[PDB]
Amino acid sequence: MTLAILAVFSVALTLLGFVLPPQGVKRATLLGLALALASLLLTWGKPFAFGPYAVDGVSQVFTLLALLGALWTVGLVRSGRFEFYLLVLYAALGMHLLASTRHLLLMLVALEALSLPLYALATWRRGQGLEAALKYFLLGALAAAFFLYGAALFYGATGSLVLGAPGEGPLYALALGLLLVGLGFKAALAPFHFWTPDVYQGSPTPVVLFMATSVKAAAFAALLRVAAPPEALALLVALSVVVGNLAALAQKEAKRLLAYSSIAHAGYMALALYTGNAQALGFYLLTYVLATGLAFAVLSQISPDRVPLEALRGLYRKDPLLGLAFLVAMLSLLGLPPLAGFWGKYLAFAEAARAGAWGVLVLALVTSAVSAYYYLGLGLAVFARPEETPFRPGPPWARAAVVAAGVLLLALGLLPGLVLPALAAGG
Amino acid sequence: TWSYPVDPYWMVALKALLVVVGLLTAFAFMTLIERRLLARFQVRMGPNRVGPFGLLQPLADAIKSIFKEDIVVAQADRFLFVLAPLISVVFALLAFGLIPFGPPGSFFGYQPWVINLDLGILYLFAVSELAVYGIFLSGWASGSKYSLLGSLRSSASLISYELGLGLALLAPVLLVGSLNLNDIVNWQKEHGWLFLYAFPAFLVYLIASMAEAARTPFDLPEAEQELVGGYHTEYSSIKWALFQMAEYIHFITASALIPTLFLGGWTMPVLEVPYLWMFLKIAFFLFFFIWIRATWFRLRYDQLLRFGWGFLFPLALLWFLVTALVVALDLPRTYLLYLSALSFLVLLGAVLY
Amino acid sequence: MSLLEGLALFLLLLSGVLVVTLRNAIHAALALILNFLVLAGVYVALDARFLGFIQVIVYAGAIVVLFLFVIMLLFAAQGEIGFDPLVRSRPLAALLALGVAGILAAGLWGLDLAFTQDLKGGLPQALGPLLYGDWLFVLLAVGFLLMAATVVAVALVEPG
Amino acid sequence: MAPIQEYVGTLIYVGVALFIGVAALLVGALLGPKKPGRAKLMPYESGNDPAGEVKRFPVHFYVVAMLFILFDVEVAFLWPYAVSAGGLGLYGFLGVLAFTLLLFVGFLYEWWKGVMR
Amino acid sequence: MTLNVGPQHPSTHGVLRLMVTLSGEEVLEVVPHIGYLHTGFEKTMEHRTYLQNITYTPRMDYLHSFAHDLAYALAVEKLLGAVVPPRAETIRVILNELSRLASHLVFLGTGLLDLGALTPFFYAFRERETILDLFEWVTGQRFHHNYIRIGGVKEDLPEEFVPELKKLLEVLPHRIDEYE
Amino acid sequence: MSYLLTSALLFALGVYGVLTRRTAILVFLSIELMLNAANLSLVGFARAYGLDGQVAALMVIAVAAAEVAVGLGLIVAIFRHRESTAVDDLSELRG
Amino acid sequence: REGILFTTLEKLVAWGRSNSLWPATFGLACCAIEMMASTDARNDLARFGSEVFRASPRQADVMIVAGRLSKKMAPVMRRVWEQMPDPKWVISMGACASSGGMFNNYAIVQNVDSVVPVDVYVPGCPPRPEALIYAVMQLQKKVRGQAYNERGERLPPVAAWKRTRG
Numbered sequence A: 001m002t003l004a005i006l007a008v009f010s011v012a013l014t015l016l017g018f019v020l021p022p023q024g025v026k027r028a029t030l031l032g033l034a035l036a037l038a039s040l041l042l043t044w045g046k047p048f049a050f051g052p053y054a055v056d057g058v059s060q061v062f063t064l065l066a067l068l069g070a071l072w073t074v075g076l077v078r079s080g081r082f083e084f085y086l087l088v089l090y091a092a093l094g095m096h097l098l099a100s101t102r103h104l105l106l107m108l109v110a111l112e113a114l115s116l117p118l119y120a121l122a123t124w125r126r127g128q129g130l131e132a133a134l135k136y137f138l139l140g141a142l143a144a145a146f147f148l149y150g151a152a153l154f155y156g157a158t159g160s161l162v163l164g165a166p167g168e169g170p171l172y173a174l175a176l177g178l179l180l181v182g183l184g185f186k187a188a189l190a191p192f193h194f195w196t197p198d199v200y201q202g203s204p205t206p207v208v209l210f211m212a213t214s215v216k217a218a219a220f221a222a223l224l225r226v227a228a229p230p231e232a233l234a235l236l237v238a239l240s241v242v243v244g245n246l247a248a249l250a251q252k253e254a255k256r257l258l259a260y261s262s263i264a265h266a267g268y269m270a271l272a273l274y275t276g277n278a279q280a281l282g283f284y285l286l287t288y289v290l291a292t293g294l295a296f297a298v299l300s301q302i303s304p305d306r307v308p309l310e311a312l313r314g315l316y317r318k319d320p321l322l323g324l325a326f327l328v329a330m331l332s333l334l335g336l337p338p339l340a341g342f343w344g345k346y347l348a349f350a351e352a353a354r355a356g357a358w359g360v361l362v363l364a365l366v367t368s369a370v371s372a373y374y375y376l377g378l379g380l381a382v383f384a385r386p387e388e389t390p391f392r393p394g395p396p397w398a399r400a401a402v403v404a405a406g407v408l409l410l411a412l413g414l415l416p417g418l419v420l421p422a423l424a425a426g427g
Numbered sequence B: 001t002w003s004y005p006v007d008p009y010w011m012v013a014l015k016a017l018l019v020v021v022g023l024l025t026a027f028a029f030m031t032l033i034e035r036r037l038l039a040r041f042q043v044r045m046g047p048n049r050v051g052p053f054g055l056l057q058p059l060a061d062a063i064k065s066i067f068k069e070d071i072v073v074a075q076a077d078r079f080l081f082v083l084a085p086l087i088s089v090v091f092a093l094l095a096f097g098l099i100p101f102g103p104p105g106s107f108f109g110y111q112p113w114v115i116n117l118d119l120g121i122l123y124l125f126a127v128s129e130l131a132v133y134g135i136f137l138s139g140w141a142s143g144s145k146y147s148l149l150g151s152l153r154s155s156a157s158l159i160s161y162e163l164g165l166g167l168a169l170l171a172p173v174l175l176v177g178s179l180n181l182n183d184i185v186n187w188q189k190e191h192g193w194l195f196l197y198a199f200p201a202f203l204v205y206l207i208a209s210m211a212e213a214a215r216t217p218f219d220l221p222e223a224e225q226e227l228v229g230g231y232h233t234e235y236s237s238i239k240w241a242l243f244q245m246a247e248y249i250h251f252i253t254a255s256a257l258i259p260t261l262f263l264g265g266w267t268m269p270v271l272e273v274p275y276l277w278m279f280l281k282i283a284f285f286l287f288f289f290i291w292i293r294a295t296w297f298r299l300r301y302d303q304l305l306r307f308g309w310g311f312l313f314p315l316a317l318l319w320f321l322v323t324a325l326v327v328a329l330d331l332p333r334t335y336l337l338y339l340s341a342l343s344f345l346v347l348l349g350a351v352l353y
Numbered sequence C: 001m002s003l004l005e006g007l008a009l010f011l012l013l014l015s016g017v018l019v020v021t022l023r024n025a026i027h028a029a030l031a032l033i034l035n036f037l038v039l040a041g042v043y044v045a046l047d048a049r050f051l052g053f054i055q056v057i058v059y060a061g062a063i064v065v066l067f068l069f070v071i072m073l074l075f076a077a078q079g080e081i082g083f084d085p086l087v088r089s090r091p092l093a094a095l096l097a098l099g100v101a102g103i104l105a106a107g108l109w110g111l112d113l114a115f116t117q118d119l120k121g122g123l124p125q126a127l128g129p130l131l132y133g134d135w136l137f138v139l140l141a142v143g144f145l146l147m148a149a150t151v152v153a154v155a156l157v158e159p160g
Numbered sequence D: 001m002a003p004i005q006e007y008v009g010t011l012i013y014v015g016v017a018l019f020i021g022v023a024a025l026l027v028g029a030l031l032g033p034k035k036p037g038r039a040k041l042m043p044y045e046s047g048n049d050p051a052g053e054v055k056r057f058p059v060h061f062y063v064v065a066m067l068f069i070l071f072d073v074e075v076a077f078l079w080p081y082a083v084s085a086g087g088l089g090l091y092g093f094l095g096v097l098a099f100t101l102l103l104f105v106g107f108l109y110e111w112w113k114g115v116m117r
Numbered sequence E: 001m002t003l004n005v006g007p008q009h010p011s012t013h014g015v016l017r018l019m020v021t022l023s024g025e026e027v028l029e030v031v032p033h034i035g036y037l038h039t040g041f042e043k044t045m046e047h048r049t050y051l052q053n054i055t056y057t058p059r060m061d062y063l064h065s066f067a068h069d070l071a072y073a074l075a076v077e078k079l080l081g082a083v084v085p086p087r088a089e090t091i092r093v094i095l096n097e098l099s100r101l102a103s104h105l106v107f108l109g110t111g112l113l114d115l116g117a118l119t120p121f122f123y124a125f126r127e128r129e130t131i132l133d134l135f136e137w138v139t140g141q142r143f144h145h146n147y148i149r150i151g152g153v154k155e156d157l158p159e160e161f162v163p164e165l166k167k168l169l170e171v172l173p174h175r176i177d178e179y180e
Numbered sequence F: 001m002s003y004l005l006t007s008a009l010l011f012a013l014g015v016y017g018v019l020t021r022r023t024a025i026l027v028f029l030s031i032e033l034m035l036n037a038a039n040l041s042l043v044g045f046a047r048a049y050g051l052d053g054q055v056a057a058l059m060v061i062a063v064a065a066a067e068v069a070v071g072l073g074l075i076v077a078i079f080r081h082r083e084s085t086a087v088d089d090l091s092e093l094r095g
Numbered sequence G: 001r002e003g004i005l006f007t008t009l010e011k012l013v014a015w016g017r018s019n020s021l022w023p024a025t026f027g028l029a030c031c032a033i034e035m036m037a038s039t040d041a042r043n044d045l046a047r048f049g050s051e052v053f054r055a056s057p058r059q060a061d062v063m064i065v066a067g068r069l070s071k072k073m074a075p076v077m078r079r080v081w082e083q084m085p086d087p088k089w090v091i092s093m094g095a096c097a098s099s100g101g102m103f104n105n106y107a108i109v110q111n112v113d114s115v116v117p118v119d120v121y122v123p124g125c126p127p128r129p130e131a132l133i134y135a136v137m138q139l140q141k142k143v144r145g146q147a148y149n150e151r152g153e154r155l156p157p158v159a160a161w162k163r164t165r166g
């Protein structure tokens, strides 16, 4: 019964942007996303199913994450073009529809409906942004072709297009692989990750925030529904984490390195797919969403266009609260106690070990230890001597948001026993 | 095709050839009659010459068009230039057999039609798109950007109103419930003269029917009088003849389709003769359209697109939603009689201020 | 059946060869339109009739028309410009292409199925009740996708 | 349903018509003076450069055609609703109603933004 | 589109050459090119008798020619101090304004025809023919009539002319009202 | 089955298109070829498993149309001012 | 193949061409208004076969040269005559076209026969429209091979067949 509000506000603001200034359109978009969030809350553990549209714990949590990211990224952009926000609602709804169904075709429709406005919103006119959008677009359409051939061979392997069907042998495995190709591409799993670095470097910083949170959230919400076999899962995880972190070492730019860190984190998240707990993965993604939203909110306060690594140094001296929150986020992405990122890490690894895949887990853990190099080179430089650096010291909105995100990360590092019960169907 | 029989293959092919030669003769004589009607409109007179009554002019024209140096222009694409007229002619000739001229067996034994496909309007819609295909493909093929501009205008305008055609033609299918035209005709026999119910949509159809080269969008464009149109300005002997022939064929095709769908396809309430009344309504639409050929100016396709987009197609979709509302609630059909009568009275009475 | 079906498949295959081969955007587009015509023929052969005629109506009539318009407005006829050839990519991708064929061939061979069901022809008459009903939600989603795509393209140009 | 042989007949129709069409071209080809010269092949209008070399022509045609593809998709959706309407009752209609609004909004959108572009 | 709207094509009445610098459906800038009809009146008139020059003057503006012949007549009369009888003057203004209506008739015909509807070219021209007959009645020529003279006019109007002119003057107002 | 193997071959051909083609617009053409071959396979299995794949293929065609509209808008936007659409000339962003 | 050398076919095809003459006007000057009048609502060239009037040169056989031919305009006319389908005839309308007329000077070509093969001349200033009708009758009965000059000769039906074009 949230889709009602989403459709209403989307359609209304669509036309209203003609009569109303974009600022009022932004106010209405924020109110609409907040009301969708409230509707999600009041439906906590109250599944609502009309067609293949099925509201369950997975959809609930993951779409809540996407909503938080959307609210946050709308907070920053002051554009006098209301379109730059309308797509948000659109994009938001798309990702929601990605999570709330098991149907492959409607999943594809949701994929395109959320991905197109992403392709468009990366256009600040900046030349590199257009190259990024074009590369992302071509690879996305190729992945949609792969996923569609997977859906076709699925409908061949079973009379329905809903996951969980009995499933045949080699044909069903072939369909599973064809689906996993596109879904991992969308989720930044290797060797389907190439798009993410280019896209994150070219795209404007707040858009990269929205993507790296909500896109990955909804993508994994969809991925969990697949009957993903252990072997392909292991290969994707191994290659993803290895390539992501190793190549991340050499990066001199903040946003690109965050892209590689997000590839490695996709590798980490892909473990829970062994058992598909989706509760532990829910918590993992909550921690990651908080951390990345915070970090990219900081990056947006500094530079929407581009932020090199050295620019972030000395950030503490300007604002202590922001420097502390950024260091906390660095650890949360490293997965260090007593921070909730470590809770998500441990949860995913428990779900993996229960499935009995060991050597992949060993490689993943060694690579996560390797990651400390750049996690520190970003976390620790916070205190170093600031060189010449553009700084625009934000509004109070973003300050309070960053502080809340850091406090929530430290709290759920200390007290995860609050939310974790209410990440299943509502236990 | 629930209730309609099927003829042998050989008779199908021979009927095809017969309809081809009949369209040859018919469009030639209608070129004559357009010449004469245009002349009669402007108090000047037609060719009282090489006839006796003028009915030998098309033969002279056909003899001239051949031997007329069918030329392959250099700096123009070799193959597409040849191919395009064939496209425009073939896809214009076909998709006319579907139109029934009578009840089954009224062909002196077998069948008025050629084929009676279950999905008629979709086939017609496809070939309507493919005619413009041939036109502007020829426009490009000539390799003169002069003709390129004309082919672009052609495709843009004709395709816009080709869209509007669907939003118009929805309603009668809602009422009949079949996509075979003969069922629609029998529907028009029992309940009667579909257009009485669907006047507004019919209007946006008629205007849409003007777009398919008939005249007055008149930014078709013609080579004469403006930026020269496509599909000519480079064709000499047979291909230009083929283009204009196909244009006239689609002209009479639309002039025959408009009565069949909305008005009284032959199926007369009175005197019920198979062919003659259909041919009479065809000639009526031809005369009205030639009246238009003579009487009115151009549109420049900018205001034309503004008109079709803002005025025709919303009206068509509105009427379609009204009709679908009625059929879903099905309470009477009379509400449409009432609303259509009022719509016609309104669209007329606003003139007489 | 098989007699003409083989010929239709060979026409489809050759049309694909050209639509991936021909360097002239117009030649390619025309090969694609012939492909869609043959494809609608195949659809009709496969007891799904409405879909083939929509394929000719929409794709041929509407879209590849627009592609033609773009390649005529944007000359681009000799696509092989700005090479950066990477000649190694020519055979290699082909092998990968060959790869992506064999696996799929491997995926589907030795598979025989129930190719007999009483669809009673894929007329829109029988397609409606599924479409509006069980499938209505997908339809609303598609409509919303189209609304978003319109707004996207508009804001995509929107010169100021 | 409806018999398949009628569709087969449709193909035969083209086979004959196209053939006569090609025959016409052949006739036109054979009967001709065929005196090729440089000036006869010239594109147009007195010496060279009818249009010449300029920047790309207006994308407005692209706008119209994209509009057309989306709205023809709309029409292709509306036909199955057009045929089977009564059996689905008001419920069925309701969907298309909302559906229409969606694309109507699209149209209305492009109306309130306009294309001078 | 560096488009060459050629001389006499496309069907541009008054053969003229235009280099339309143009992208799309607007008009960036039209560079005109003329010289395709220069006949050399202002030169040949240096080699022709004054009386002879009435053979030259009307054939330049062929629509409103008698205004040219009239301007020439008046110029020479002022030059050498000639006196025009009032009857000559009256017939002069009558035939000149009659050719004015002829000019406007063909003007609207060619305007509507060149772009627009073809039918109303005929009716005006139909009326025009009566005008032309009038000239043929008095001058023996359709137009380009060699009638005026430096002193005055060639000869008197024949007996048959005046009723025809009254006929046309009685039918024209309804004709013009129709066109409007 | 011949039809579905043909779908496989056509999908492979469109893949070679996307890998091979230098210009954005022809890549998009190959993308449409791939999606439509997929819809062909959908039609075969819809004949097999009860008619749902037909409405599926219709919706897939609609989706392809929408993303075609947007992708062509983008292809225009990049190379309306810029030189040839050829995609190999875009290398500013490197790993 | 040129439509020649068979007793029946050549007569028949020449008959057809003669009666189907499609004019392509090359409008220059004041003769052209009388040329327009040759189709008006009092004397119409709407019977012999010249009703239809494709101003394009790709769709017409008969070229009516109506007016004074300034020399800058000569090569344009050269190409437009060359830009016709090959069975083409040139009619010289008005005094200015055939000879220099009263404009015997640097501005005008003193004989159109210089650039294009002139078939039929029609004097007058302007020639009455019916003089244009008689001119197209001359050309008509010419292409049938039914034309004799004051020397008595049968004249060849098509000029622009007798020139070593270049």
Ligand SMILES: CCCCCCCCCCC1=C(C)C(=O)C(OC)=C(OC)C1=O
Binding pocket: E011, E012, E013, E014, E015, E106, E107, E110, G025, G027, G028, G029, G030, G032, G033, G035, G036, G039, G053
């Ligand atoms: C039925 C079509 C008759 C038109 C035939 C003549 C072609 C039009 C161009 C000729 C012309 C010229 C040269 C011309 O100079 C002129 O005066 C400016 C005209 O009309 C006002 C003309 O029509």
Ligand code: SF4
Binding pocket: E059, E144, G029, G030, G031, G066, G067, G068, G093, G094, G095, G096, G097, G101, G124, G125, G126, G127
């Ligand atoms: S002959 Fe007389 S009417 Fe003809 S062009 Fe010359 S001056 Fe004009």
